[PDB]
From Swiss-Prot, chain A:
Expression sites (tissue/organ): Highly expressed in spleen, thymus and peripheral blood leukocytes. Highly expressed also in T-cell and monocytic cell lines, expressed at lower level in B-cell lines. Not detected in fibroblast or neuroblastoma cell lines.
Post-translational modification: Phosphorylated after T-cell receptor activation by ZAP70, ITK and TXK, which leads to the up-regulation of Th1 preferred cytokine IL-2. SYK-dependent phosphorylation is required for recruitment of PI3K signaling components.
Subunit structure: Interacts with SLA. Interacts with CBLB. Interacts with GRB2. Interacts with SHB. Interacts with PRAM1. Interacts (via SH2 domain) with CD6 (via tyrosine phosphorylated C-terminus). Interacts with FYB1 and the phosphorylated form of FYB2. Interacts with 14-3-3 adapter/YWHAZ; this phosphorylation leads to YWHAZ proteolytic degradation. Interacts with VAV1; this interaction plays a role in TCR-mediated cytokine production. Interacts with AGER; this interaction plays an important role in AGER-mediated pro-inflammatory responses and cytokine release.
Name recorded for this polypeptide: Lymphocyte cytosolic protein 2
Swiss-Prot record, chain B:
PTM characteristics: Phosphorylated on tyrosine residues by HCK in response to IFNG and bacterial lipopolysaccharide (LPS). Phosphorylated by FYN.
Tissue: Widely expressed in hematopoietic cells but not in other cell types.
Domain notes: The DH domain is involved in interaction with CCPG1.
Extra remark: 'Vav' stands for the sixth letter of the Hebrew alphabet.
Residues represented out of the complete protein: 629 to 775 of 845
Function according to Swiss-Prot or TrEMBL: Couples tyrosine kinase signals with the activation of the Rho/Rac GTPases, thus leading to cell differentiation and/or proliferation.
Encoding gene, per UniProt annotation: VAV1
Name the record gives this protein: Proto-oncogene vav
SUBUNIT field: Interacts with SHB. Interacts with SH2B2, GRB2, GRB3, DOCK2, SLA, TEC and ZNF655/VIK. Interacts with SIAH2; without leading to its degradation. Associates with BLNK, PLCG1, GRB2 and NCK1 in a B-cell antigen receptor-dependent fashion. Interacts with CBLB; which inhibits tyrosine phosphorylation and down-regulates activity. May interact with CCPG1. Interacts with CLNK. Interacts with THEMIS2. Interacts with NEK3 and this interaction is prolactin-dependent. Interacts with ITK. Interacts with PTK2B/PYK2. Interacts with HCK. Interacts with PTK2B/PYK2. Interacts (via SH2 domain) with SYK.
S-S bonds: none
All residue ranges annotated as the SH2 domain in the record: 28-122
Amino acid sequence: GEDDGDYESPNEEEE
Amino acid sequence: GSSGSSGKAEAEQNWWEGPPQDLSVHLWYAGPMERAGAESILANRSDGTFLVRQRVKDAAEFAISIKYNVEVKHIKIMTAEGLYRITEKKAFRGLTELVEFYQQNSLKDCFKSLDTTLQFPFKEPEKRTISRSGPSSG
């Protein structure tokens, strides 16, 4: 799809 | 696919002739090396090692791979008109700065997962809190 999170993800909780 | 071929790429051969400016200058460098190639590096080395690798998709793409939590982590670095940033909130001007910056700012800020910052590069770390400030530059 469009989204791609192959690497680590940044602060999610923190909008 | 959902698979990962096996490889070691173990071979010490330097057939170069005085290469010009290149990431090499930095105490940390990583060519097109694959995942395993990076993991092993940060896996065998001391806990907290890191380096700078480039992606194949876009020549102008870097990634910071560091070993932590009994596992090797990696980050995708962006590039805008000669820029460098891994987050939308934060943004840098050069790759070097982004690296020499994390060493002071725990990646935990952005990557809550990684509760650690660049401890040691690929070649060798620094000493005597050596750093180069950027006067009216950047």
